[PDB]
Amino acid sequence: GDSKVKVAVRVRPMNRREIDLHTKCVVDVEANKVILNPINTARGQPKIFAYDHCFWSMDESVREKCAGQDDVFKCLGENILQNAFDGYNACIFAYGQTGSGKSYTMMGTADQPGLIPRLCSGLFERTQKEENEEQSFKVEVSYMEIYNEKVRDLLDPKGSRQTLKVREHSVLGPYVDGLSKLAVTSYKDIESLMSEGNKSRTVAATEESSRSHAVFKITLTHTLYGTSGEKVGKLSLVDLAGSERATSNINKSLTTLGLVISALADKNKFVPYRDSVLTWLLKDSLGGNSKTAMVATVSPAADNYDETLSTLRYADRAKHIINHAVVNEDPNARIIRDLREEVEKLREQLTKPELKDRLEESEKLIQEMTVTWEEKLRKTEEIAQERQKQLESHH
Numbered sequence: 034g035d036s037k038v039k040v041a042v043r044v045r046p047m048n049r050r051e052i053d054l055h056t057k058c059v060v061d062v063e064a065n066k067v068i069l070n071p072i073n074t075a076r077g078q079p080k081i082f083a084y085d086h087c088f089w090s091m092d093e094s095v096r097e098k099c100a101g102q103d104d105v106f107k108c109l110g111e112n113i114l115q116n117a118f119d120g121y122n123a124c125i126f127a128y129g130q131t132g133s134g135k136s137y138t139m140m141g142t143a144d145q146p147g148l149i150p151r152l153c154s155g156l157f158e159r160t161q162k163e164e165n166e167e168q169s170f171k172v173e174v175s176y177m178e179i180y181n182e183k184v185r186d187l188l189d190p191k192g193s194r195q196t197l198k199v200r201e202h203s204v205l206g207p208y209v210d211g212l213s214k215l216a217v218t219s220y221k222d223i224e225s226l227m228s229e230g231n232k233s234r235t236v237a238a239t240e241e242s243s244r245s246h247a248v249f250k251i252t253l254t255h256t257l258y259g260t261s262g263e264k265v266g267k268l269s270l271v272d273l274a275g276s277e278r279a280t281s282n283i284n285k286s287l288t289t290l291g292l293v294i295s296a297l298a299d300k301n302k303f304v305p306y307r308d309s310v311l312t313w314l315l316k317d318s319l320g321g322n323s324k325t326a327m328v329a330t331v332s333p334a335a336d337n338y339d340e341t342l343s344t345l346r347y348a349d350r351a352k353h354i355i356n357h358a359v360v361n362e363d364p365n366a367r368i369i370r371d372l373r374e375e376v377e378k379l380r381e382q383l384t385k386p387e388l389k390d391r392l393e394e395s396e397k398l399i400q401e402m403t404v405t406w407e408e409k410l411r412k413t414e415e416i417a418q419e420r421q422k423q424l425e426s427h428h
C-alpha cells in the first residue's frame with residue numbers, strides 16, 4: 034500500500050490508590066519500547082513490545098501532565114492536522130481498558146485539554162491565518178455516540194435518547210441518517226457544542242457508561258481560486274469503549290473491532306466490517322482511504338496485567354495494517370454527479386419495490402448536500418440560541 038497505521042502506547046502514571054496500597058508497577062518504557070514485567074518475580078519472563086511512539090510520565094504533577102498532553106499533541110495532533118490541510122482523511126482512535134486514559138487523551142480535562150480541543154484551536158488558527166480572497170475554508174463538525182449498536186446525536190439540543198438509523202447507499206456508502214453536521218466559524222462554537230455534547234453521554238447503572246463509543250468528526254473544505262478548485266480533509270477522533278472483559282450485543286462493536294484489526298493484520302470480503310455499527314461506519318479508517326493512528330492507553334500496575342498485555346497485543350497487530358490515503362479533490366461535485374446519475378437511471382428502470390423510495394433516498398441526499406453555506410450557518414445559529422434558551426426555562 035502507501036502508509037501503515039501508526040501506533041502509540043500511552044502509559045498513565047501510578048495514581049494515589051496504586052501508591053497507597055503498594056500495587057506494584059509492572060509496565061515501564063524504554064524509548065519506543067514497552068516492557069511488561071511479571072507480577073510475581075513457570076513462565077514469569079519480561080515481555081517486550083515495540084511501537085511507533087511511547088508516552089509516559091514520572092508522576093501526576095501538573096507539570097508532567099501539561100508536558101504529557103503537549104507531547105501527545107506534538108507527536109500525533111499536528112501531523113493529522115497537517116493531513117487535514119493536505120486534503121487527506123485522517124483518524125485517531127483511543128483503545129484500552131476503563132481508567133487507562135482514553136478520554137483524558139482524546140478530550141482531556143479543563144486544566145489538561147486533550148487532542149480534540151487543541152486540534153480545533155490549531156485548525157481555526159491556521160485557517161484564520163491562511164484565508165485569502167483566493168483561499169477559503171469551510172469547517173463542519175459532528176459528534177455521535179454508539180451504545181448497544183445504536184447511534185445517538187450528541188449535538189442535538191434535545192438529548193432525546195432517540196436512535197438514528199444507519200443506512201447504506203451504493204455510491205455514498207454507510208451513513209447515519211439524521212446526523213447533525215454543523216457549520217462552525219470559530220473555536221468557541223465547537224467548544225460549546227462539545228461541552229454540551231460531553232454532558233449528553235449515556236449514563237450507567239451507577240458516572241458515564243464505559244460501554245459507549247464516541248466519534249468526533251471535523252470536515253475541512255479548502256477552496257483555491259478564473260475558476261476554483263477544492264480539497265476536503267476529514268478528521269475522525271474516536272474515544273472507544275473499555276476494552277476489558279464483561280464483569281446481548283453491548284460489546285458487539287468492540288469485539289468486531291478486534292476481529293477487523295486481526296483480519297487486516299493478517300476486497301474486504303472476509304473482513305467483518307459489516308458485523309457491527311462501529312466497524313461499518315469506520316470502515317474507511319481501517320485499511321481504507323485514511324491516515325490512521327491508534328493510541329493504546331494502559332495502566333501501569335500489576336492489578337491490570339492481563340488487560341494491559343491484551344491491549345499491547347492488539348496494538349502490536351494494529352501496526353501491521355496498511356492504509357492507502359489519497360488527496361480528496363472536489364469530492365462533493367463527484368458525489369452529486371454520481372447521485373444525480375443514479376437518480377436518472379433509477380427513474381428509467383422505474384418505468385418497467387426496493388427502487389420505489391431508493392430514488393427518494395437519493396434525491397433526499399442530493400437536496401441535503403446542496404444546502405447553501407449561509408443556511409447551514411443559520412441552522413447552527415438557531416441550534417446555539419435554542420441551547421441558550423433551554424437553560425432559560427431551566428433557570
Ligand SMILES: Nc1ncnc2c1ncn2[C@@H]1O[C@H](COP(=O)(O)OP(=O)(O)O)[C@@H](O)[C@H]1O
Pocket residue numbers: 043044045046090093098101129130131132133134135136137138330
Ligand atoms: N496520561 C495520563 N496522565 C495523567 N493522568 C492520567 C492519564 N491518563 C489517565 N489519567 C488520569 O486517570 C483519570 C481516568 O482517565 P480516563 O480518561 O477517564 O480513562 P478512560 O477514559 O480510559 O476510562 C483521568 O481523569 C486522569 O486523572
Ligand SMILES: [Mg+2]
Pocket residue numbers: 135136137
Ligand atoms: Mg473515558
Ligand SMILES: [Mg+2]
Pocket residue numbers: 173174175214250251252
Ligand atoms: Mg461530518
